[PDB]
Amino acid sequence: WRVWLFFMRGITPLLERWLGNLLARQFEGRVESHFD
Amino acid sequence: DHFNKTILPKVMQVKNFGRSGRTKYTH
Amino acid sequence: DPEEDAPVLDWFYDHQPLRDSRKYVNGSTYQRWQFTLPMMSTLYRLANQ
Amino acid sequence: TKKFTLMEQTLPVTVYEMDFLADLMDNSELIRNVTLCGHLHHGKTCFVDCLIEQTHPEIRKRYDQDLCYTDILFTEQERGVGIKSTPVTVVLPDTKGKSYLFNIMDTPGHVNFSDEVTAGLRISDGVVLFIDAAEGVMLNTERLIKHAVQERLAVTVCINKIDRLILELKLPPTDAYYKLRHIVDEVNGLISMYSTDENLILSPLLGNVCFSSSQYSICFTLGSFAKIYADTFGDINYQEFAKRLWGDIYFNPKTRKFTKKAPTSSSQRSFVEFILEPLYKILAQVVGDVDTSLPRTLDELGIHLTKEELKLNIRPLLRLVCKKFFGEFTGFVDMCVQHIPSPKVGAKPKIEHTYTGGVDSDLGEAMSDCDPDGPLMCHTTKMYSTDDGVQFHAFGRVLSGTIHAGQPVKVLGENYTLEDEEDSQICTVGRLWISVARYHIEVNRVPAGNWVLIEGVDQPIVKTATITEPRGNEEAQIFRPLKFNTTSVIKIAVEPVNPSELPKMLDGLRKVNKSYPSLTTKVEESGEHVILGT
Amino acid sequence: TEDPDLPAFYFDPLINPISHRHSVKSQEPLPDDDEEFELPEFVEPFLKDTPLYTDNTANGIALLWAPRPFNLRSGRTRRALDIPLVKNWYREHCPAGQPVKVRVSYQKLLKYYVLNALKHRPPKAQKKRYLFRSFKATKFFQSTKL
Amino acid sequence: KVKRSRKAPPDGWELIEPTLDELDQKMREAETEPHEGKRKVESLWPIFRIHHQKTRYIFDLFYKRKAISRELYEYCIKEGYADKNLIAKWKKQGYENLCCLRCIQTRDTNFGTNCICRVPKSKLEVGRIIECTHCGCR
Amino acid sequence: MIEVVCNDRLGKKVRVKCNTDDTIGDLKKLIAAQTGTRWNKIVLKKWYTIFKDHVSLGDYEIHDGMNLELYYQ
RNA sequence: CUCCGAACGGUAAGAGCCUAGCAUGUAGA
RNA sequence: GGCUAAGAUC
RNA sequence: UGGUUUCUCUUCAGAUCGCAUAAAUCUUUCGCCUUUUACUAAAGAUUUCCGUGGAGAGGAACAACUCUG
RNA sequence: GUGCUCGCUUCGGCAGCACAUAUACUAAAAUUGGAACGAUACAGAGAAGAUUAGCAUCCCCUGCGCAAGGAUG
Ligand SMILES: Nc1nc2c(ncn2[C@@H]2O[C@H](COP(=O)(O)OP(=O)(O)OP(=O)(O)O)[C@@H](O)[C@H]2O)c(=O)[nH]1
Ligand SMILES: [Mg+2]
């Protein structure tokens, strides 16, 4: 129980950035030549 | 697993370019 | 049994007196808790297994 | 300063640095130059911290971890054995307690570190050693007893860690007196090897044994515990007629008689009925039942414990109840009577065993008072280092003299100080002060008796050297070097990885030879820099 | 203590005793006793000897040598996700026999014991707090108990 | 229903046993009512109405009639017979017949005020048959 | 013993080791033991070829590693 | 000796006809 | 109109 | 001198703030490598989240039981 | 509605005093307009190429992207 409670403790800051843009697209709508 | 995997030269765990884990389980 | 576990009879059976005992008051909303000497002595008998 | 600990903004003290510390250094009759030896882990460096907490109001004691202030090196705090002795100068009052200079030096007790003990024993006078009450004698106790008696110094045993006999063994108090008598018989039996102190037998009746507990801050010497008894409405002539609690048996019929007979079938001695019987009772009343009868025992014994101290754990409340009861370490009054023979006044055989004669020119001169000798009589025996590691500092007890800031001293070497004068390399020692465990004083003058930390006169010094004034010295015989009493049999070679850094390893081997006394870096004939070790 | 029938302070049988304890020769009364015969005493002893030695001594002294959870007399908050209950015998050189599964399992459990403490030791500064408490103060959420 | 304590409730609980059982059976039948008929928040109106009558029975037995013991009063508030916050708002003289505890919240309204439930009819307008949507009634 | 990998869509891909003479009804019991569904509600398919419930694995020539597209009925 | 991998790189390309599970909640007279 | 290996180029 | 609790909001945290311990990012390293993400763990420092510590502000419950002095 | 007025003054009530002061994208609604590359039937990726290539100077979709990919002037 201790390891998987810490798995969701690390994914809860993660999934708001992972699936934050997924729930947002449904209502917002999505060399060396430079030195020369 | 039908091969004996001892005549083989050093080790062949997975020859599919994905060997992330580096272990042989003796330590 | 109520012979060796007498000070830990009612306190060691539920989670609501485990944080909100309010007897020899221990910070009712789960704060710094203070016990006695035979209270932790009967505790060490069960933890020894 | 990530090498060793140092001062922290000039920590305060109960003793005045000018009204009490300056006057004590001038008076040679109250000096009490001591040096603790102890066993390997018998609680000697922790015991010096208990004297600091009794003198200084710096309450940083054993709440969670230990408070070892004598071990200043960072390796001594990580490994926990200590590899450097540290002199501590504090004001420890006696039972009367006006002022004592208390020139103490806590030496480590590892068996391979015997060279640091022989440097401190041949420099200081007092050899008060600590014995752990749980184990008794050890291998470090047998070597230190032969080294102290051969140097013609004093001896005073002290059974430290006395809390282990009750709180860690649960021994009965009747058998505890039989075990404590087994230590004093073995210590006096081991002291009967050098037949020169047959009249000076280590006994608690003569004020030699001084009981204490370095772990839990207690002290139960026969002079100090009697004064604590008479202070609690006793009035039974403390330290005047209370010297009969050893072997004699008290009796409630004929209460004014400490007879040697045994009236009852179960009636132990007076020590296990007036001293060890409450000491086993006071530890059991706080560690056995802290919720019931704990203020009842504190009010009966006269110990006003606050509510904040009552809300502590079982370990610091035991030390706080004992510190409020006993208080000041008055047990060293017996260590000032039976031991600590007041150097520069009663230090006549000390100069006879250190100096190589010097009759009618330096024997009567160094045995005289502090001021009127004149050529500073300096002898350093330990070379410390600063925070940078380059600039060294000397350390030694001034025998008879006072060279404060300006007067330079010809650094008399080990072999360069005979009748054939090889080299002196005189330099002005202007940064000499007195040292402490963590703090460091800043004094100008330096009379005899005190331990002076002379700076700037340590660069032409690789071992225990002497310093004298060039203002008319008659070139007397220099002091003998300190016999470590252990041959460095182990030899390990050392060479740098990059061969271009050859003088960098050569300069480091010279600086390491000045720190450790037994480290004799002998360059081999094959070019391999060898290092002899214990 | 093997059993709580022995008293508080008792000479345990697993202790190497003192053999002689009769080195002195004091069968006759010593002349120091007649010298201290002029030393009167009528006061109470250094502590009040009204109680016995100790009543709850075997339970109290064994609680002093107990480890960190069973020795402090002031229990803190101590979250349920912060009391591991497995590292007490993980970093202890456990296996007496030799399973092939227990060897790598003890090595890997001691690996994350070190790695979560070797580099993962910050001072842990922070500035913000009360994440879900802002939702409770809104005009739409509501607190209850079930 | 399970008492969720199993701690031997004292005397006076048997005197209030069938009365609290009839109120609990009314709320369970109201909770099993379908969503038809109610417009948007009218289905939660019998949930607070059965809860308002359940708190009024314990408060009248403790304060008004004073027949129930304080040990049975504390056991009833702990088992869930009446909310402690609802009895606390009724202790004040300013609110004795409040509709719901949600209507007394100052942060619930968008304009930052109270509801129409906590307003007398004489101080209100003349033509108004309005009911509180959040609370349930006046 | 062939290791048939019942690799359906949307992450559901498990390995199912079965005997060569084992029937397809025994394979669905082993496929349900790694997937987490009722074995009666699993229909195996390979391009609209719904397998039967009584034909052995040795008749389809399903060798080792021959993956199947699992579906639910 | 027991360390067990997932997706993309993949089914095309088009003509005529046929049927569907979806969403907004307005100012106006 | 710029940078790319007279940009390689019969 | 005079208040046990509880909930909201304002700072600094250099104390194993955490007696235990997640994820992501950046700069360097290894193994596979076949396009890439999911990869393996050694070093260092930047966030997010699970949490916490003293000290002023506003409500509720006996604040009155009279707590230390 | 709750408690009180040395009120009328009966104790049936009346009048006054004190507290409580504006919830509600408002409905159980009315309609309004249509999208599978989804099945079925028809033919079945050419059985054939002389400019030699990229870099930066405007947007939809797959994807969680401070990786990436298709189409682009
Ligand atoms: N619990 C407890 N421990 C003690 C007591 N006395 C000494 N000790 C332990 O004994 C150890 C040894 O003391 P140190 O401070 O290291 O001094 P030392 O005896 O000279 O040992 P070294 O420094 O290694 O030479 C200390 O670390 C203490 O933990 C005591 O009374 N109670
Ligand atoms: Mg020490």
Q: What is the DSSP string of D178-209?
A: HHHHHHHHHHHHHSTTSTT-SS----TTTT--
D110 is in an annotated binding site: yes
Helix, strand and coil in chain A, % to nearest 5? 45, 0, 55
List of chain E residues whose C-beta atoms are within 8 Å of the C-beta of residue B21:
none
Max CA distance (Å), chain E: 96
In the 23-52 stretch of chain E, whose C-beta falls under 7 Å of nucleic acid strand H? Answer: none
Measure the CA–CA gap between G68 and E11, rounded to whole angstroms.
77
E-contacting residues in D 235-264 (Cβ below 8 Å): 235-237, 241-244, 247-248, 250, 255-261
Four-residue CA torsion sign, G47, G52, G53, G59: negative
b/e code D370-405 from CB counts within 10 Å (16+ = b): beebbbbbbbbbbbbbeeeeeebbbbbbbbbbbbee
Bridge partners of D468, per DSSP, are D410
Measure the CA–CA gap between D5 and D11, rounded to whole angstroms.
14
Measure the CA–CA gap between D242 and D247, rounded to whole angstroms.
13
Q: Which residues contact G15 (CB under 8 A, 6 or more apart)?
A: G3, G4, G5, G6, G34
The residue type of E105 is: S
User: Which phi and psi (to 5°) does residue D343 adopt?
Assistant: -65, 160
CB distance A5–E81 less than 8 Å?
Answer: yes
Bridge partners of D310, per DSSP, are none
Q: How far is D166 from chain C (nearest CA, A)?
A: 19
Measure the CA–CA gap between E64 and E59, rounded to whole angstroms.
9
* Token pair 């094959």: residue: D526
* Token pair 């790598």: residue: E104
3-state DSSP assignment of residue E62:
helix
Measure the CA–CA gap between D91 and D99, rounded to whole angstroms.
6
Candidates D64, D165, D170, D224: best to mutate against E (most CBs of E within 10 A) is D170
Q: Please, are residues D174 and D268 in contact by the beta-carbon 8 Å criterion? A: yes
Q: From the centroid of its chain, how far is CA E53?
A: 22
* Token pair 């990580």: residue: D78
Q: How far is D218 from chain E (nearest CA, A)?
A: 15
Measure the CA–CA gap between E90 and E67, rounded to whole angstroms.
15
The reply to whether F127 has its C-beta less than 7 Å from any atom of strand K is no
Burial class (CB in 10 A: 0-12, 13-18, 19+), E28: exposed
Measure the CA–CA gap between A3 and F40, rounded to whole angstroms.
43
Distances (CA, A) of D276 to D212, D268, D525, E32: 12, 11, 63, 22
Measure the CA–CA gap between D219 and E46, rounded to whole angstroms.
14
CA angle E38, E42, E47 (to 5 degrees): 125
Positions on chain K within 7 A of a protein C-beta: 1-3, 18-28, 54-56, 60-65
Estimate the crossing angle of helix F45-59 against helix F84-91, to 10 degrees: 70
Q: Please, are residues D439 and D397 in contact by the beta-carbon 8 Å criterion? A: no
Give the CA D468 to C1' J28 distance in Å: 59
Give the CA D272 to C1' J65 distance in Å: 47
List of chain E residues whose C-beta atoms are within 8 Å of the C-beta of residue D260:
26, 29-30, 32-33
The residue type of C27 is: G
Q: Which residue is nearest to nucleotide J48 (CA to C1')?
A: A13
Q: Which residues contact D330 (CB under 8 A, 6 or more apart)?
A: D93, D94, D95, D97, D219, D221, D223, D224, D227, D228
In the 1-40 stretch of chain G, whose C-beta falls under 7 Å of nucleic acid strand H? Answer: 7, 11, 13-15
Q: Please, are residues D398 and D449 in contact by the beta-carbon 8 Å criterion? A: yes
The residue type of D62 is: R
Measure the CA–CA gap between D463 and D515, rounded to whole angstroms.
8
Q: Please, are residues D120 and D105 in contact by the beta-carbon 8 Å criterion? A: yes
List of chain E residues whose C-beta atoms are within 8 Å of the C-beta of residue C42:
59
Measure the CA–CA gap between D370 and D446, rounded to whole angstroms.
10
Where does residue D217 fall: left (phi above 0), alpha (psi -120 to 50 degrees), or beta otherwise?
Answer: left
- What single string gives the DSSP state of each residue in D312-328? S-HHHHHHHHHHHHT-S
As given in the structure block, the two tokens for residue F80 are 């869930």
Measure the CA–CA gap between D423 and E59, rounded to whole angstroms.
70
Measure the CA–CA gap between D281 and D294, rounded to whole angstroms.
12
Q: Which residues contact D504 (CB under 8 A, 6 or more apart)?
A: D496
Q: Please, are residues G58 and G19 in contact by the beta-carbon 8 Å criterion? A: no
Q: Tell me, what DSSP letter sits at residue D435?
A: B
Tell me if there are at least 3 CB pairs under 8 Å linking chains F and D: no
CA angle C2, F74, F21 (to 5 degrees): 105
Q: Please, are residues D124 and D118 in contact by the beta-carbon 8 Å criterion? A: no
Other beta carbons within 10 angstroms of residue D357's beta carbon come to 11
The residue type of D80 is: G
CA angle E1, E4, E6 (to 5 degrees): 80
Bridge partners of G23, per DSSP, are G56
Measure the CA–CA gap between D57 and D60, rounded to whole angstroms.
9
Q: Tell me, what DSSP letter sits at residue D434?
A: E
D44 is in an annotated binding site: yes
The reply to whether A36 has its C-beta less than 7 Å from any atom of strand I is yes
D156-160 and D128-132 strand pairing: parallel
Give the CA C28 to C1' J5 distance in Å: 8
The residue type of G67 is: N
Candidates C23, C36, C37, C41: best to mutate against D (most CBs of D within 10 A) is C37
Measure the CA–CA gap between G31 and B10, rounded to whole angstroms.
36
Measure the CA–CA gap between D217 and D319, rounded to whole angstroms.
6
E133 nearest nt, CA–C1': J8
CA angle D256, D259, D263 (to 5 degrees): 100
As given in the structure block, the two tokens for residue E7 are 């008293």
3-state DSSP assignment of residue G69:
strand
Q: Which residues contact E95 (CB under 8 A, 6 or more apart)?
A: E102, E103, E106
**Side-chain-side CA neighbours of residue E111 (13 Å):** 7
Q: Tell me, what DSSP letter sits at residue D18?
A: T
Q: Please, are residues G7 and G69 in contact by the beta-carbon 8 Å criterion? A: yes
Specify the length of chain D in residues.
534
Four-residue CA torsion sign, D293, D296, D302, D308: positive
Bridge partners of G13, per DSSP, are G7
Q: Please, are residues D4 and D73 in contact by the beta-carbon 8 Å criterion? A: yes
Specify the length of chain E in residues.
146
Q: How far is C26 from chain D (nearest CA, A)?
A: 12
Measure the CA–CA gap between D226 and E46, rounded to whole angstroms.
9
CA angle E13, E14, E18 (to 5 degrees): 75
The reply to whether E86 has its C-beta less than 7 Å from any atom of strand J is no
Q: Tell me, what DSSP letter sits at residue D256?
A: S
3-state DSSP assignment of residue D104:
strand
Q: Tell me, what DSSP letter sits at residue D398?
A: -
As given in the structure block, the two tokens for residue C23 are 């007897």
The reply to whether F99 has its C-beta less than 7 Å from any atom of strand K is no
Measure the CA–CA gap between E135 and E143, rounded to whole angstroms.
10
Burial class (CB in 10 A: 0-12, 13-18, 19+), C36: middle
Measure the CA–CA gap between D309 and D290, rounded to whole angstroms.
12
Q: Which candidate, D209, D218, D111, D121, places its Cα nearest to that of D161?
A: D218
Measure the CA–CA gap between D407 and D388, rounded to whole angstroms.
26
Measure the CA–CA gap between D99 and D229, rounded to whole angstroms.
23
3-state DSSP assignment of residue A34:
coil
Bridge partners of G44, per DSSP, are G70
The reply to whether A2 has its C-beta less than 7 Å from any atom of strand J is yes
Q: Is B27 on the interface with E (CB under 8 A)?
A: yes
As given in the structure block, the two tokens for residue D144 are 């230190």
Give the CA D309 to C1' I9 distance in Å: 97
| Given resolution (angstroms) | 4.2
The reply to whether A23 has its C-beta less than 7 Å from any atom of strand K is no
User: Which phi and psi (to 5°) does residue C7 adopt?
Assistant: -75, -10
Bridge partners of G56, per DSSP, are G23
Bridge partners of D219, per DSSP, are D212
Other beta carbons within 10 angstroms of residue E120's beta carbon come to 8
